[PDB]
């Protein structure tokens, strides 16, 4: 009789995800009246409730830029990376 | 019934209603206290039941954490023509039957209670006193609000209620408004800080951090236990409360041999001889901080 259990070797983990689509995203610096301490970020057809009302962005050209078939890895506090395999929701032996 | 090992003194009684000192002076596993057992009923007082190892309002009052208001409890028998029942009438409560008193935390951050005349009981809304012939009133007071208290030194003199779109909450007049006024009854969370008044909040973002202070340990003893208090033959297996002030601190002096779990042994000095009491670490205790 054999009882086997897995244990983690390194005290770190990696997060694997995929990008279904890419979205245009504009960063604005709001040089307000008597003071320019205001920086905002917003996407297509979206509004942000800043001071003195709100600021909206149309960006009517293209709200998307297609999709992809790779996978992305994130190591928290260390950065990101790209792996050239399709993102599979079912585990497979010999893969990521 | 580990929840009946109260932190601090555990004095769950109110001034004047001192006819239940057998079981409401320090609350132990044995007796039954009317002003405490209501908190442990299933489905009622869920916020305290989550933070079950923190002090109640009466416990905080008896530890001088929370002060007592001016006219601490203006009796309806002698002061029913005085502007007393003002903060109570803006709350929507629900008292059970056979209760002659009920305590709450008033606007100033102190404890005030409503006491019916003798032989009367508070109605279902705790607003009126009614008399029933041949009824046995409970000896305690019903806790009106769902709250838990603790000991803090953080100052809050600059803390004030900041609610958006609210002209007036409870008895506090936030601002002056004219026109439409949607008036309703709502469940508002609130907090009380040192040197401040009641502070109503739009959101409740609170976190707890653990420590090794004496209030975070539950120390008990057995009844009939050899070489301990109440060392006599028993007909039932029951526990007894123990005071952690006797167990020596690590690298220190004490009066009783004391053993416990990992946290206690890390904090206090666990004995190598026969122990007098067992000191476990509190289920959920700690220090709670509100955002």
């Amino acid at each position: 009789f054999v009882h086997t259990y897995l244990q983690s070797v390194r005290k770190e983990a990696l997060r694997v995800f995929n990008c279904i689509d890419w979205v245009h995203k504009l960063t604005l610096e709001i040089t307000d009246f008597d003071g320019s301490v205001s920086t905002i970020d917003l996407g297509a057809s979206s509004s942000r409730f800043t001071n003195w009302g709100s600021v909206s962005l149309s960006l009517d050209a293209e709200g998307i830029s297609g999709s992809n078939s790779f996978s992305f890895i994130e190591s928290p506090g260390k950065g990101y990376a790209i792996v050239d395999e399709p993102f599979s929701e079912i585990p497979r032996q010999g893969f990521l | 019934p580990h929840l009946r090992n109260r932190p601090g003194k555990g004095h769950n009684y109110i001034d004047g209603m001192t006819q239940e000192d057998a079981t409401c002076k320090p609350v132990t596993y044995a007796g039954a206290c009317s002003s405490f057992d209501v908190l442990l009923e299933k489905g009622k007082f869920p916020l305290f039941q989550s933070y079950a190892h923190h002090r109640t309002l009466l416990e905080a009052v008896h530890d001088t954490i929370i002060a007592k208001a001016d006219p601490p409890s203006c009796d309806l028998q002698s002061a029913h023509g005085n502007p007393c029942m003002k903060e109570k009438l803006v709350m929507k409560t629900h008292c059970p039957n056979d209760y002659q008193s009920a305590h709450y935390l008033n606007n100033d951050g102190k404890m005030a209670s409503v006491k019916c005349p003798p032989k009367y009981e508070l109605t279902e809304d705790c607003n009126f006193c009614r008399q029933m012939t041949g009824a046995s009133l409970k000896k305690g007071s019903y806790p009106l609000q769902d709250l838990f208290c603790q000991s803090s030194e953080d100052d809050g003199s600059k803390l004030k209620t900041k609610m958006k779109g609210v002209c007036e909450v409870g008895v506090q007049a936030l601002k002056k408004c004219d026109g439409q006024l949607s008036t309703a009854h709502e469940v508002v969370p609130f907090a009380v800080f040192k040197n401040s008044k009641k502070v109503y909040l739009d959101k409740l973002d609170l976190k707890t951090e653990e420590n090794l202070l004496p209030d975070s340990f539950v120390c008990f003893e057995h009844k009939g236990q050899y070489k301990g208090t109440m060392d006599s033959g028993q007909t039932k297996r029951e526990l007894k409360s123990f005071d952690i002030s006797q167990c020596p601190k690590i690298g220190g002096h004490g009066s009783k041999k004391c053993t416990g779990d990992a946290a206690f042994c890390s904090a206090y000095e666990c004995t190598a001889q026969y122990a007098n009491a067992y000191c476990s670490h509190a289920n959920g205790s700690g220090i709670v901080q509100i955002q």
């Binding site: - | 009796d75 028998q77 002698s78 002061a79 029913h80 023509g81 005085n82 005349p117 003798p118 032989k119 009367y120 008399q131 012939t133």
Partner: protein, 58 residues
């Protein structure tokens, strides 16, 4: 009629108890289980039932 509290006092004073207009009875804690009967009959207060302001002694 008039919301009175009929109380009993004794001198071997010491308050024994009272019976109210509503039939509610309150007793001294020691005696829970010359004799006079004095009640607040003239100095009535509109804000409270100050029944210990004894006058009109029996």
């Amino acid at each position: 009629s008039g919301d009175y509290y009929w109380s009993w006092i004794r001198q071997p004073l010491e308050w024994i108890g009272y019976i109210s207009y509503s039939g509610s009875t309150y007793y001294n804690p020691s005696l829970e289980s010359v004799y006079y009967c004095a009640t607040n009959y003239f100095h009535l207060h509109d804000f409270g039932d100050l029944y210990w302001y004894f006058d009109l002694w029996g």
